[PDB]
Amino acid sequence: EKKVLLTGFDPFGGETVNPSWEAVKRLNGAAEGPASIVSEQVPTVFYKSLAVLREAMKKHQPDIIICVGQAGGRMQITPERVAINLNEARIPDNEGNQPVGEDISQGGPAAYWTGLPIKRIVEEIKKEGIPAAVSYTAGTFVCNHLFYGLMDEISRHHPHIRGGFIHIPYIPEQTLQKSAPSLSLDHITKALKIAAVTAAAHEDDIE
Amino acid sequence: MEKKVLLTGFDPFGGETVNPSWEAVKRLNGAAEGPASIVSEQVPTVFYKSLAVLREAMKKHQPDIIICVGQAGGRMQITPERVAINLNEARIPDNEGNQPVGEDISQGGPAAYWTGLPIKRIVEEIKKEGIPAAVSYTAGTFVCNHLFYGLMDEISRHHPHIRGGFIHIPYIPEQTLQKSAPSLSLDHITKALKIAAVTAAAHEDDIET
Amino acid sequence: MEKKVLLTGFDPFGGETVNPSWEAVKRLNGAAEGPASIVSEQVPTVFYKSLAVLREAMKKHQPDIIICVGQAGGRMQITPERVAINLNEARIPDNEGNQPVGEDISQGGPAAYWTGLPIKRIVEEIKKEGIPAAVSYTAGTFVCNHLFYGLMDEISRHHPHIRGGFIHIPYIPEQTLQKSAPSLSLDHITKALKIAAVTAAAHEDDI
Amino acid sequence: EKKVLLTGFDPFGGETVNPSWEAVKRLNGAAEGPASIVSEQVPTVFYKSLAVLREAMKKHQPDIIICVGQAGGRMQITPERVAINLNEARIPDNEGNQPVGEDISQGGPAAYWTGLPIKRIVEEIKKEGIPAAVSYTAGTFVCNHLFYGLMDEISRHHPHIRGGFIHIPYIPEQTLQKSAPSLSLDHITKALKIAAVTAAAHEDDI
């Protein structure tokens, strides 16, 4: 049986909801097949987000970690292939930090690849009738920061963990004033559950 | 005052296997909410025949309100239509091979008909339930606009007391697995159409927002 | 033979410093191209007043063909308009503070007027020159659609011999430096408008 | 005087024109300020593209290398910040190669950063009225392959050379049958020349 830690962020910008936390909160305590899921919220703040993730890692001793974030504008569930060593914020984080041209780990690699079997995950989500695709950029805001920090912590200190990041679209209630694509919270939650079960079931990806 | 609301959705088209406009309205057949009593009928995705089928459904049900529904793939909101235009301009053929170009729907009829539904109220009530919606000012020139214009022409000429109009819906997620595109779940689309029926049943007059 | 073609473009609108619809049509003022003799006049971005200025330009030039031009930011092609609708629905005010909502342009006038230009021919002749173009079925509900409906209404009621219509153009690149959006160069837009004027002067009939 | 080598791609399937090559060809032999420019064409083929680039580098001994490719759908000139070590092709290249899940360099790093002052380049192009922005993904097709292979060569053999990649949008004549954003070939060419001059004038970014 594998313990899967999912994280979601609190609302950022002028938002009042973040579908990443709303979806992962629903899966706290869920178990299916080889997966047992636990969820933790991470603040949308550079540096502090990584400290909170490390605390959740110590609390839960997970085998698999899937950090989730919102990518407004996207139309599919998108597991991320690669995290980059760069904080480049177009807007400030929830405490006002707005780093530009900053390394996340000084002397760390330019990038880290995901440790999750994302092609299998994309296919299992599509099998269930929900759109999904691999993404090759997680941005340069707090989501990519958390993804790079997670892979760095895994590489250096906990290599047994299979970890990675999945971005999700807006939910419909976030698109009432400006037209934008969304996926329902029910579908996003289902996709994240499929991701957790798939990662727990397979260490190895397909081609 | 109870109002009978006729909803229509289209039969299967475009290489698709599911026409979501029908999947959604079929769920509402026989539904009763607020002052709305809803009945649903399927219309073929065929120029000319679609309007004959609509007229037959109108005769069968004697509706007070009519809301014809079709799919506008690519849109990201539920979009009640403001205006129907007197033109069939098909870039691909319909289910029976008809591909009209530059054709009037009603020869000598008006260039356009405005909707008879309180669409600004419908957009606001859908958004109050957390579902995106907006007024659209073009229903295209394919069978959806054809049905809308035909519906308004039949109301104007033969049953002016009927309040009718058209609403387009986006793709549902299952239609966007091979080529990315925006969608809304069938559950949210069905709920939005139910809201539109109840809103039109409850209010003859639109708001001015 | 010769056909007098009146082209219009709009005056500056806030936030902008030059309106490209005018910048392009002004370049064609006095041009003799094929059977077209082109003259250009500027119209204010104001409900009601725009139509009065158009009427004066019609009296002044006695045109045979009238093409009003406006900008539809976000579009990716030159787009001649098929239909004008009898509605002013403004999400922001015009240049003189008018923000009509749910208002008829002509009380008792038809719900719509079709264009009088050979727009399919125009689209094909523009594409023949390597410039993107397509027919549009909505001119919006702001001042552009307003001027289009008013032009067709004035033609129908008072000068039925005139062939009139409306063409929207995209942003120019210089308008897309702070927020990404499609554009076409001022040179390509000017060339497309010249082709439209020549095409309309050479053909009353559409393909 | 800095020798700047620009590359553009050969004709690709469906197109009869590769605008990255049409634009850089115009600049072959151009001299402006501190830049002396030369251009070379590379085939849209995995592995062979890198061989042609290495030969061009041997011939010209450039100080600066800017490889250019087309990213249909974008609406700005986009210098790339990062190349990744992966060939993942959804369509075949011009010689039928369709690599899936393959490293570009076995044992090379997951990514390389660009060596060009791309923020300066973006700003100088916008000063001339042309849209531009930094991109953080060059894709996983032949363009990213050429970019990663370039950075691996620089690391490898000539660390002083400053190199990178810039994607350009479609030109209007490629958007007649299916609508899409574009920039004129003259504006793309001017932007690429600004990039070359900016890179030659400045080793450091802003």
UniProtKB/Swiss-Prot annotation, chain A:
Its main location: cytoplasm. One of its GO terms (biological process) is proteolysis. It is found in: Cytoplasm. GO terms for cellular component: cytosol. One of its GO terms (molecular function) is pyroglutamyl-peptidase activity. Its EC number is 3.4.19.3. It comes from the Bacteria. This is Pyrrolidone-carboxylate peptidase. It comes from Bacillus amyloliquefaciens.
